[PDB]
Design a protein around this ligand. Structure first.
Ligand SMILES: Nc1nc2c(ncn2[C@@H]2O[C@H](COP(=O)(O)OP(=O)(O)O)[C@@H](O)[C@H]2O)c(=O)[nH]1
Ligand SMILES: Nc1ncnc2c1ncn2[C@@H]1O[C@H](COP(=O)(O)OP(=O)(O)O)[C@@H](O)[C@H]1O
Ligand SMILES: Nc1nc2c(ncn2[C@@H]2O[C@H](COP(=O)(O)O)[C@@H](O)[C@H]2O)c(=O)[nH]1
Lengths: 203, 198
């Protein structure tokens, strides 16, 4: 039986990376996908861990070769999910979580129906920019650019099945765990999981 | 924000009552609905505890008056959920859980936006038969007949480990409140603020 595809989206600084890492730590049957990008590395990022960093020319070569399940132009740079990160794992029964923008999520919904998509919101407009300040060493000029990019991302929240407002971190983790647990209890997933038991009960 | 309508259905002997009771103890935002029935009270029964017991004439009067949100002929007696048991709590923001049969579950799915329906299965056929040989055969047959409608429900829980079954039902309640359309109402002002420029 094929694995389930999960998408968690949020503007940067809403805390999706930290919530997802705590959730997958608690729910290890979902594997995290490492995206490719052509944007430059930020301090604290490690190539091969947080992203597969490539040049813009290399990313575009990979586009032409069909290497990407989805890809999109995000904040002036390429971001993308390689086919090797999704299609083989889903066919092998591995659940996969993608952390992508709304453009990539729209492409994925067209390719894989049944994807479970979640959007994470900050608890206030001020809380968003406060979290950007605490995280990086970004100049106030960069922070202003990211906030404008954050509103652009949040304008597409309505495309997602679930919405989490990340006020209390531990609560947001519980709530994402609840969504992942609930998705395994959906009728069609349980029919596969318990085909023999159900066959026995109804005969 | 309006409350959610939840339906938990199961054949007898799946352990549904204990799972629902344990969930309500953990989640005080969930009100349990007391159904009306025309079945005769058995000795020792308390009206208003498990059911609102009425006469067959009174139940049918209530059917005629449109008093029932859903109602059905269940195992030879009338069963139904009155609107006064759900509509006020739903409007006040309290979630309401219904313990009804599949006939009632079908009616509610048609009526109310957001209704979440959950079907609970026993972990094996032998586990059910453990929970008059002709009466036992009748009871298993009513159990099989109810399980034939599991495919009409949004979620399925197999009650193998009790504590896991309660967690899973709680997870379903939590997840349902995070659905987009509920959260847009709940955080309407927040979303307007986040999407408005400087
Ligand atoms: N449609 C409907 N079915 C109900 C309602 N209340 C209970 N039932 C169903 O009636 C069946 C018998 O209920 P139960 O209390 O276990 O048995 P009883 O004590 O002999 O009536 C179960 O399958 C319940 O799901 C109700 O309000 N509406
Ligand atoms: N609920 C929260 N309350 C306060 N700070 C939070 C909360 N969630 C995350 N943070 C912090 O906000 C910043 C955003 O971190 P991160 O998860 O990487 O955000 P994103 O991946 O959305 O860019 C981090 O400094 C993180 O520790
Ligand atoms: N389309 C797409 N967007 C991605 C991918 N990986 C990360 N993103 C998104 O790009 C945005 C910017 O991330 P950042 O540049 O801050 O790491 C975030 O919304 C993030 O989720 C990917 O593989 N595809």
């Amino acid at each position: 039986a094929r694995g389930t595809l999960y998408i968690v989206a949020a503007p940067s600084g809403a805390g999706k990376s930290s919530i997802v890492n705590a959730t997958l730590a608690r729910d290890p049957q979902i594997a995290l996908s490492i995206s490719f990008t052509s944007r430059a590395m930020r301090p604290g990022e490690v190539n091969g861990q947080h992203y597969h960093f490539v040049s813009a020319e290399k990313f575009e070569q990979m586009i032409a070769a069909g290497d990407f399940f989805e890809h999109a132009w995000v904040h002036g740079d390429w971001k993308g999910t390689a086919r090797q990160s999704v299609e083989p794992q889903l066919a092998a029964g591995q659940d996969v979580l993608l952390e992508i923008d709304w453009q990539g999520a729209q492409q994925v919904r067209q390719l894989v129906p049944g994807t479970v998509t979640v959007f994470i919101l900050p608890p206030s407009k001020q809380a968003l920019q406060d979290r950007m300040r605490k995280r990086g060493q970004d100049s106030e000029a960069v922070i202003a650019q990211r906030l404008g990019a954050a509103r652009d991302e949040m304008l597409h929240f309505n495309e997602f099945d679930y919405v989490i407002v990340n006020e209390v971190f531990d609560t947001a983790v519980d709530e994402l765990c609840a969504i992942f647990t609930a998705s395994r209890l959906r009728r069609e997933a349980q029919k596969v999981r318990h085909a023999g038991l159900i066959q026995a009960l109804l005969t």
